[PDB]
């Protein structure tokens, strides 16, 4: 029924962006890819590498916005947890931009990812 | 005078981030030793991963190692500022089994380069 938090699981947020979880190793270290689809924003439609951690239903993942096609000069990190007939990951994220000088410049928000 | 591999950074609690590698893509590995008095998961290395992008940095550690578990994950987002190199960060701590975003703990750490 509901999708679980596993290796090879995909999750789509309220902007249409997808986290593709690839591996979760014996220690819970995560690899994957992220495709941003937030309308009006840059760094869309191409895969960005992700790393992070899973601990039971807790998860962190982070992406650097640089790949072979486009840079957005920043890094986003999500912290969240799995909840469940639809599996979801509820998160709070922080975005830090290269060249920042003040903590006030770190952007924050909430994403809820739903199973594919 | 910038974020580098093989560097050590100590926060206001006396906890140390050891940056071990920053690869060609800026992917980070390291270890974290928590030394905040009264807390568990102290004095032993916890593996770290993350990213560096110029002066921006993210790093995260799962609180499970060969010694003990604190059932949670901390993630830091921050930036390098500079004679003293520092990393100014905001962190979030998520606990296994949480049910509400209100349960994600937040704070600020400033790490000073100690070399």
TrEMBL record, chain A:
A GO term from the CC aspect: extracellular region
A GO MF label: biotin binding
Keywords assigned by UniProt, alphabetized: Secreted, Signal
Keyword Secreted part of the UniProt annotation: yes
The species this protein was found in: Shewanella denitrificans (strain OS217 / ATCC BAA-1090 / DSM 15013)
Entry protein name: Avidin/streptavidin
Disulphide bridges: 43-72
Subcellular location: Secreted
Chief location category: secreted
Binding, biotin: 13, 17, 34, 36, 42, 74, 76, 111
Origin organism lineage: Bacteria, Pseudomonadati, Pseudomonadota, Gammaproteobacteria, Alteromonadales
Part of the whole protein covered: 43 to 160 of 172
Top-rank taxon: Bacteria
């Amino acid at each position: 029924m509901a999708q679980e938090l596993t290796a090879m699981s995909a999750w789509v947020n309220q902007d249409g962006s997808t986290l593709y979880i690839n591996s979760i190793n014996a220690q819970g270290e995560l690899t994957g890819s992220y495709i941003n689809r937030a309308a009006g924003f840059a760094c869309q439609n191409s895969p960005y590498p992700v790393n992070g951690w899973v601990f039971g239903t807790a998860i962190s993942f982070s992406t650097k916005w640089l790949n072979s096609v486009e840079s957005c000069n920043s890094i986003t990190s999500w912290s969240g947890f799995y909840i469940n007939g639809q599996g979801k990951i509820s998160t709070l994220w922080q975005l830090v931009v290269n060249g920042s000088s003040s903590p006030s410049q770190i952007l924050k928000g909430q994403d809820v990812f739903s199973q594919t």
